[PDB]
Each structure stands twice: as C-alpha cells, then as structure tokens.
C-alpha cells in the first residue's frame, strides 16, 4: 500500500579529533539501500541492498555526484552555523538533514519532506504545501531569507513531486519481492512469576516486516495500560523486527488478560491468551 523513501544525513565537526565527517543513508520504508561516508576510501555512493545493485553505472555516477556535493555543502554549513550562533571554533556540533516523499497505494504523491536540525534541535523545515519554510530560531531566519531568494522551495517541490516519486516507484518494482513483502509477526507468550501473588505476562512479536506494529493488553476488554511495559520496536538484524508487551497480573487471573497484535501482514487482528 503506502510507501516512503527517506534520506538521512549527519554532518559532525570534531576539532582536534578528526576532520568533519558526513554520513548519508537512504531508506525505502524500513529497508536501507544506499550509504555515503565521507571518511570511507570509496568516495562513492554505495549499495546496501542487493536489489539496488542492478542499477547501472550512470545511476551511481549521478547519485555520487549529488551526495558528494551535499557532503561539501553541509560541512561548510557547520562553519556557517558557527557564525550565525557566534560559537567557538573549538566545539563539536551536529547538522542533520531528512529528505523524502510518501506515496499511496496507487503510487501517486502523498507528502514530501525536507528538514534540518542543528545540535539536535529543529533548524528549518519545508512546510506541508512545499511552498514555504518554517524557521525555528533567528539563525534559521537568515537561511529562510536566502532560500526564498534562491527559490529553493520551488525546486524541492518539483523534485519531491517528480523524481522522488518516480524513483520510489522504480525502486519498489526493482526490489519488489523484498520491499513489498509483509512478514507477519510470529507470536507467543511467556509467564514469569514475580511473587507468589503476582506474575508477568509478556506477549511477543518476532520476525515481522515492516516495523509498524501495535501490541495492546486488555483484561475482559478495555485497554489495560496500567503497568503495560512496552519496549521500543527493534531490528533483529536480518531485515525483520521485534517487539514485546508485558503486564503484571495477580496470580490466578491470567485467563482474564489478552494480548492483541495488529500488523499489515495479519489479515485479522490476533488475540493471544496465556494457558498452562
């Protein structure tokens, strides 16, 4: 159905510890497919998924050109930020960019993004209409005035609506068996006594793709959020994801509680219930 493409870039300065470093990664949904690292000896945009390796050398030349240009631009942008914020030459600083587009089931444009952050806080962001900029502080007002003068929003809007959408559609067909798969979660429960009068029911979801999932606990109905522990969804390392939900229940009342799993790979929501 719906799909997203994302580029995440990080530029860091580290005076006295190394030259400024730029790292960019590209994602289709939860699958990384390219990377560029200004420290590596390649100096090329590199493949990170087997299905992007089918692209010809004209692709890698063009992508490498755009990402080395960004590498140079965002390293200079760290120096520009030092002036905007009147900061020392000696500090270490972080500059991040996120870019990409979403498409619906039909493959048509849904929403695009192009946002920056400086030292972990929002710097500038292209608004929803792709026509104006949100400047978070006073330094970013200068960049906003610069990008209005260079008509940056108009160029990025055409890029987000055209090449981004067309590229995503192309990626989805070339890596179809990987990117349009849905691996449903494999589920089970564990029972761990805390005391003689209390126990932990932990509801497990393993090996699912994509990462979006809902784990909820209910007793006899209604959300049992009271002491519902919920770990952040985590990568298994093989392309699938993991999550679990746990609640503490009075001993002997386990049959009252049910775990509900909702995921794109499950046609109907699962209701799991523990049993000796």
């Amino acid at each position: 159905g719906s799909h997203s493409m994302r580029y995440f870039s990080t530029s860091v300065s580290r005076p006295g510890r190394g030259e400024p470093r730029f790292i960019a990664v590209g994602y289709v949904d939860d699958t990384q497919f390219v990377r560029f690292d200004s420290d590596a000896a390649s100096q090329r945009m590199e493949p990170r998924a087997p299905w992007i390796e089918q692209e010809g050398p004209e692709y890698w030349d063009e992508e490498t050109g755009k990402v080395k240009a960004h590498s140079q631009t965002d390293r200079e942008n760290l120096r520009i930020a030092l002036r905007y914020y009147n900061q020392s030459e000696a500090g270490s600083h972080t500059l991040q960019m996120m870019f990409g587009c979403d498409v619906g089931s039909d493959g048509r444009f849904l929403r695009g993004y192009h946002q920056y952050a400086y030292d972990g806080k929002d710097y500038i962001a292209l608004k929803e209409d792709l026509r104006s900029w949100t400047a978070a502080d006073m330094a970013a007002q200068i960049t906003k005035r610069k990008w209005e003068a260079a008509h940056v929003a108009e160029q990025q809007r055409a890029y987000l609506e055209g090449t981004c959408v067309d590229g995503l559609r192309r990626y989805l067909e070339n890596g179809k068996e990987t990117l349009q798969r849905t691996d449903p979660p494999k589920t089970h429960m564990t029972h761990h006594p805390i005391s003689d009068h209390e126990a932990t029911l932990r509801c497990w979801a393993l090996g699912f793709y994509p990462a979006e999932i809902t784990l909820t606990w209910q007793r006899d109905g209604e959300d049992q959020t009271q002491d519902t522990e919920l770990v952040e969804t985590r990568p298994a390392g093989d392309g699938t994801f993991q999550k679990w939900a746990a609640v503490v229940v009075p001993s002997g009342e386990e049959q009252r509680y049910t775990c509900h799993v909702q995921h794109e790979g499950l046609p109907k929501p699962l209701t799991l219930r523990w049993e000796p």
Binding site: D74, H114, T143, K146, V152, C164
Partner: peptide, 8 residues
Amino acid sequence: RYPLTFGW
C-alpha cells in the same frame, strides 16, 4: 534519488 542541497 538523492536531492539537490543548498547552503545555509
């Protein structure tokens, strides 16, 4: 596809 990027 990688985007065009601009200076601050």
